[PDB]
Design a protein around this ligand. Structure first.
Ligand SMILES: [Ca+2]
Ligand SMILES: [Ca+2]
Ligand SMILES: [Cl-]
Ligand SMILES: [Cl-]
Ligand SMILES: [Mg+2]
Length: 547
């Protein structure tokens, strides 16, 4: 049995955490934990549980040393093999910080200076000060070819385009967790240019993209362009070598609504930070109400790229972020606008569009973001509003109970990873992390430790306790992706990838092993702001809750 076969959280364990490793295959009967320094025997485990998934004949053996609670460095010996690990406070803090700092590396329109960036420094790229109104985006005062400035914001992912749906959703998710852990985020410092101001660094980072988002709203009708893009994806070149023309394209109802929701949300969160962000809270709220108004007038204005390409030139072939179901965006936006303005007219829209069931958050399914807003503590809800919130809590708990059913008997001892349908493009964020986030919220709503225990299990999975043995976050753990599908990492002249990115993961042989660490793997090794938003959400909340 190779050392390789011992699958565990490669960052380590909190002192009071469940502590489980899984041997991926082979006959095992016993394991031992040793103090790495003193050489003292600390724990011996026997009578070990084993299990198999439906699709793999490998015998997975569970090693449970949860009773070891003293901080320190330890050695796990199983048969021939061994691995060292740490038990320590704040074990996920470097992960939470790196996940947030990834957004800094994605920033456009500014130099990425070594002081903050380390070896992954670069010159400014994509100023986006000379951007064309695409014919699909034309308005009376802005005919096709009009030049606008639409600067700042993040690169979306492995490509260099900027998308309102995905970035609005991403901020919406991170700012949901922010609101639960104000002290945590106030104290967090991640060495970005804004680390010495008076504003929590998470909010500084969000604002870098929020400021860009404001420029994507037509100052007349209030509508919001779906994305800022080149016509084609660029090759794997540095930002300074990119030469395609940049366009803003067709206004969409989902762009308008995700803009409205996140701007209404942001209005509240930045109210205290007029010093560093003067006027933003007020501007965001005004902008939000205008965007929501536009969406009301154009409720079925979906972004269909194929149809756009039949009517307009140049053809656009970058990320679609298409959706013909806007009820959830209406729900999230109306909910945020209700909480920011108090107006009953927005409440009624939220109630009309309420979800019947809880589903985890995703870029095109924003029901959960609305639900999180309704479930927020400290907000003094009236009888009807409390009754509504209570009904949403019930649905969250129904979802959570179903997710955790049988989790302790799974091969990898987590709710995520024992169903073939768990594996697909971006699954580690979309399902594993966001299932974790959902479980963390269920803990917050009930105080039932079992939900939180299961959230940590899903985190252990992405950090190495899985079928491949990868810690699926660049720059962290023992065996992590060195070749992400990421134009920034691939085109710099630095061997190690930019750190802190969650790769998409296995995406179909065994479905949970359908992963390749190569730069051409869009299918399994892509990185993205919405995937990192999930990682920031789960890692930050699990670290904050550990104390
Ligand atoms: Ca700051
Ligand atoms: Ca939707
Ligand atoms: Cl691109
Ligand atoms: Cl779901
Ligand atoms: Mg590189």
């Amino acid at each position: 049995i190779p050392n390789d076969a011992i699958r565990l959280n490669q960052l380590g364990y909190y002192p009071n955490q469940e502590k489980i490793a899984v041997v991926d295959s082979g006959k095992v009967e016993e394991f031992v934990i040793w103090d790495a320094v003193s050489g003292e025997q600390v724990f011996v485990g026997k009578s070990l549980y084993t299990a198999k998934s439906a699709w793999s004949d490998k015998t997975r053996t569970t090693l449970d040393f949860s009773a070891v609670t003293t901080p320190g460095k330890y050695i796990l010996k199983v048969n021939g093999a061994s691995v060292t690990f740490l038990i320590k406070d704040s074990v996920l803090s470097p992960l939470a910080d790196a996940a947030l700092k990834s957004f800094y590396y994605q920033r456009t329109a500014m130099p990425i200076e070594e002081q903050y960036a380390g070896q992954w420094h670069r010159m400014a790229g994509h100023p986006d000060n000379h951007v064309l109104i695409h014919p699909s985006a034309a308005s009376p005062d802005r005919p096709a070819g009009t030049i606008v400035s639409s600067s700042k914001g993040w690169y979306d992912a492995g490509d260099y385009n900027k998308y309102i749906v995905n970035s609005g959703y991403s901020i919406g998710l991170m700012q949901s967790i922010y609101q639960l852990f104000l002290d945590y985020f106030s104290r967090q410092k991640i060495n970005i240019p804004e680390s010495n101001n008076h504003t929590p660094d998470l909010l500084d980072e969000m604002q870098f993209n929020l400021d860009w988002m404001l420029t994507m709203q037509d100052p007349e009708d209030g509508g919001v362009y779906h994305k800022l893009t080149t016509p084609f994806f660029e090759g794997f070149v540095k930002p300074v070598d990119c030469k395609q023309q940049r366009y803003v394209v067709q206004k969409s109802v989902t762009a308008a609504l995700d803009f409205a929701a996140v701007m209404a949300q942001s209005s509240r969160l930045f109210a205290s930070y007029e010093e560093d962000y003067p006027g933003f809270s007020k501007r965001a709220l005004l902008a939000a109400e205008k965007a929501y108004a536009w969406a009301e007038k154009h409720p079925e204005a979906y972004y269909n790229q194929n149809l756009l390409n039949q009517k307009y030139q140049p053809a656009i072939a970058t990320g679609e972020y298409g959706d013909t179901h806007a009820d959830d965006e209406f729900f999230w936006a109306a909910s945020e606008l209700y909480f920011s303005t108090g107006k009953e007219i927005y409440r009624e829209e939220a109630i009309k569009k309420a979800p019947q069931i809880y589903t985890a958050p995703g870029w095109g399914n924003t029901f959960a973001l609305g639900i999180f807003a309704w479930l927020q503590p400290g907000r003094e809800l009236n009888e009807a509003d409390r009754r509504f919130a209570d009904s949403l809590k019930t649905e969250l708990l129904k979802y959570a109970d179903k997710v955790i059913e049988g989790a302790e008997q799974t091969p990898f001892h987590a709710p995520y990873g024992n169903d073939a349908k768990d594996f697909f493009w971006g699954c580690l964020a979309e399902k594993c992390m966001n299932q974790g986030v959902s479980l963390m919220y269920a803990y917050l709503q009930t105080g039932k430790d079992v939900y939180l225990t299961n959230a940590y299990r899903n985190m252990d999975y992405i950090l190495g306790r899985n079928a491949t043995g990868f810690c699926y976050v660049t720059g962290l753990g023992t065996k992590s992706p060195k070749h992400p599908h990421h134009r920034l990492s691939a085109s710099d002249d630095i061997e190690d990838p930019i750190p802190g990115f969650l790769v998409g993961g296995p995406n179909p042989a065994s479905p949970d092993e359908s992963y390749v660490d190569t730069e051409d793997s869009y299918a399994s090794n892509e990185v993205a702001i919405n995937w990192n938003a999930a990682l920031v959400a789960l890692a930050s909340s699990l670290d904050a809750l550990a104390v």
